């Protein structure tokens, strides 16, 4: 049954995101495991802020206007 | 003194640019109206939740096809 941070494993990277559930969820890969689980952004933001920031930094797309 | 050297508390990021060759954020500081650029590398460390709030508000999804 245990999934997400409840597995007690360390975050490796975030590989996807969805807000279909009505809240933002990140698909998280874990160190020393081939499993990935959805975790609440609310939880990821504080438990691994730098992992969250790296997910976003890699996905920037730019536009401009005067 | 500019950016974090001004010794103010970050309030929110109001924009960004990569033109310097490195990512930088335009930072609004608490009780001030003069915002200035700070490097993303410094902001990520010194105020990660403020950075995250900025990105989260701009996250969307594109489709294929």
């Amino acid at each position: 049954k245990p999934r997400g941070f409840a597995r007690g494993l360390e975050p490796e990277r975030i590989i996807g995101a969805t807000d279909s559930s009505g809240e933002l969820m990140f698909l998280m890969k874990w160190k020393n495991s081939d499993e990935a689980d959805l975790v609440p952004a609310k939880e990821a933001n504080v438990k691994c802020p730098q992992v969250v920031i790296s997910f976003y930094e890699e996905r920037l797309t730019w536009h401009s206007y005067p | 003194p500019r950016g974090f050297a001004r010794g103010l508390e970050p309030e929110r990021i109001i924009g960004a640019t990569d033109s310097s060759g490195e990512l930088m954020f335009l930072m609004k500081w608490k009780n001030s109206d003069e915002a200035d650029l700070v490097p993303a590398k410094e902001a990520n460390v010194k105020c990660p939740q403020v950075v995250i709030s900025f990105y989260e508000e701009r996250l969307t999804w594109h489709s294929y096809p």
């Binding site: 797309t61 | 701009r58 969307t60 489709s63 294929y64």
Partner: peptide, 16 residues
């Protein structure tokens, strides 16, 4: 139409 969505972060490029 079968579709697949991917996350993007949209940023306005500022000056300076």
């Amino acid at each position: 139409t079968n579709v697949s969505l991917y996350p993007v972060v949209k940023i306005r490029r500022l000056s300076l």
